[PDB]
Structure 1
């Protein structure tokens, strides 16, 4: 198989900045202790593409998580804060759009390339957090 547009996401990434993540976690419903420990974490994210399967791994002192998925096809995910969610990830004009549904709630995580960075925008209702990753 040849190159794909989403190969722009492939690589090893490290968190370099975070804004409003505590408030995002509060809106999601994360409890105090998990918010405190998760907010300290400086994760690395490892993204790879093999055929139609995209894999995103996160490694940190808080948790190590991994999802593999095909665009547009719903899957089960256990999040770092231990939510059991139903997730669907699509590509919208170069942006990976990840919707998680659980307990009648929903949150959207968008991942996009900007300059040499990978920007992750996490949205829960009116609350947005921006997390910026650079190449490791």
Structure 2
């Protein structure tokens, strides 16, 4: 197998900034104690590509998580804040677009490369958060 555009995401990343994540989590419905502990976390994100399968791992003092998926193919995800969601991730012009659906709600997480950073932008009912990762 040859190179893929999404190889731009592959590597080991560390959170360096987080904006408005508490308000995003409130909109998602995250309870007080989980919001406080999850908001403190400075996760590492490890992204790998093997054939058609993309794996995104997150490691932090709060939770360790791993999802593996094929673009366009829905999967079951248990999120770090313990939602059981249906997730679909697609590639739109270089941007990984991740929709989570649960309990009649939905949120969108976009992951994109900007300069040497990995930028994560998420939105829930008009509330956006931006989290920036750098190479570890």
CA apart distance, 1:55: 0.1
C-alpha displacement of 1:5: 0.1
Structure 1 stretches of 4+ moved >6 Å = none
Unaligned runs of 5+ in 1: none
Q: Which residue of 2 aligns with 1:17?
A: 17
Per-residue Cα deviation, 1:78-123 (whole angstroms, up to 9, x for no partner) = 0000000000000000000000000000000000000000000011
Cα shift readout 1:21-79 (whole Å, capped 9, x = no counterpart):
00000000000000000000000000000000000000000000000000000000000
Once the 2 structures are TM-superposed, how far is the Cα of residue 17 of structure 1 from its aligned partner?
0.2
The 3-state SS of whatever aligns with 2:24 is: helix
Deviation at 1:125, TM superposition (A): 1.2
Q: Distance in 1 between matches of 2:114 and 2:125?
A: 24
Q: Which runs of 5+ in 2 are unaligned?
A: none
Aligned-partner Cα distance in 1 for 2:126–2:103: 18
Alignment of 1:1-136 (within 5 A): 1-136=1-136
Give the Cα–Cα distance (whole angstroms) in 2 for the partners of residues 11 and 125 of structure 1.
31
